[PDB]
């Protein structure tokens, strides 16, 4: 009947059945309680996903708050990288986090994040869209990689010899790129744009 | 007599009815009123179905894969991202349908001409490739988040703005009233400005 045991079991079930197979019914079953028992901790699948996402980001310490002396640039880098590693620590992590939003218990943290960026000279709007850009990019990079790896198993492999010369060279790079370098390339573009943006402002 | 276009039209309607998770070739054949081998000639499996749905969405909604005459690379990437976004938004789970795709052989000339264009404008082949991939990833991400949040919205209590701190309240107001397009355009402009900084560094 403990929140913590509910969440630990649910994380285990996530890894066993993935996000699409997860239900409150199967969690009640794995826990051995009557639906209304579970209901009081987790009212529906959506609330279960929301709780799972809070737990993942908490336990992997997604970097929501800047350290003293941390530049805004490094702060956004650390936020992205730590979020990414939190998402990659659980089956369908990115999918679980895709639908989340700040809970009331997180409003102080969220406010402090925006306060930090606006203290650097970003407008509220720009601080907001910066954080959102880093979030959606990070989600997109993880989700695209995951799905590309499934998809290439359900389709004939491409034939390199059929590729015209630039594309062939492109193909060869991407064979070797790795997920983390793709992610970091985009991340750095975003940070560099924000710097330019902050100067102009 | 079943034509490919009918398969695709009907599959796009079924996508809207049941979503990407619920879409199956069995349900499509039932919808078309045909036996399973008749459909199979057109789409061998669910992956082939998604591949063909993505191609149709991007074709119909005129995703900007080809630069205009005299178009700058900046305007090219803006138009690519924006048009791709609207294509993904045209159908339920549209971003998820495009998420697993890759160039087909029939698109290799398109993809070549895109790399030729970007290198002509002064990018290395490597940075031309990674630029396009970063814009694509950002655009998929934005629409993934938009479409999932649309569903999530109806499965939980709505927040209470009056209990929010000042800056977060201002943020909430912005997102509720301006919707997802300004946030998307902001991030796109960041990527373009980052790419300009990259050309300067490689000067
Ligand atoms: C940027 O990381 C992050 N993480 C979460 C969990 N949510 C958000 N943004 C968010 O929730 N935005 S919102 O528009 O849905 C919102 C909800 C409640 C209060 C304020 C706001 Cl802006 N970003
Ligand atoms: C940039 O928009 C876009 N659209 C599609 C459909 N695919 C891609 N990229 C892509 O397919 N990359 S790839 O590495 O899997 C590839 C496959 C075949 C030949 C070359 C390459 Cl690079 N981008």
Curated annotation (Swiss-Prot), chain B:
Q: Where is the HTH tetR-type domain?
A: 1-61
Molecular-function annotations in GO: DNA-binding transcription factor activity; metal ion binding; transcription cis-regulatory region binding
Which processes are annotated in GO (biological process)? negative regulation of DNA-templated transcription; response to antibiotic
Binding residues for tetracycline: 62, 80
What residues does Mg(2+) bind to? 98
Taxonomic superkingdom: Bacteria
Which positions make up the DNA-binding region? 24-43
Q: What UniProt keywords are attached to this protein's entry? A: Antibiotic resistance, DNA-binding, Magnesium, Metal-binding, Repressor, Transcription, Transcription regulation, Transposable element
> Could you tell me which PROSITE patterns the record lists for this protein?
HTH_TETR_1, HTH_TETR_2
Matching PANTHER family? HTH-TYPE TRANSCRIPTIONAL REGULATOR RUTR, TRANSCRIPTIONAL REGULATORY PROTEIN
Q: What the protein does? A: TetR is the repressor of the tetracycline resistance element; its N-terminal region forms a helix-turn-helix structure and binds DNA. Binding of tetracycline to TetR reduces the repressor affinity for the tetracycline resistance gene (tetA) promoter operator sites.
Any idea what this protein is called? Tetracycline repressor protein class B from transposon Tn10
Name the lineage.
Bacteria, Pseudomonadati, Pseudomonadota, Gammaproteobacteria, Enterobacterales
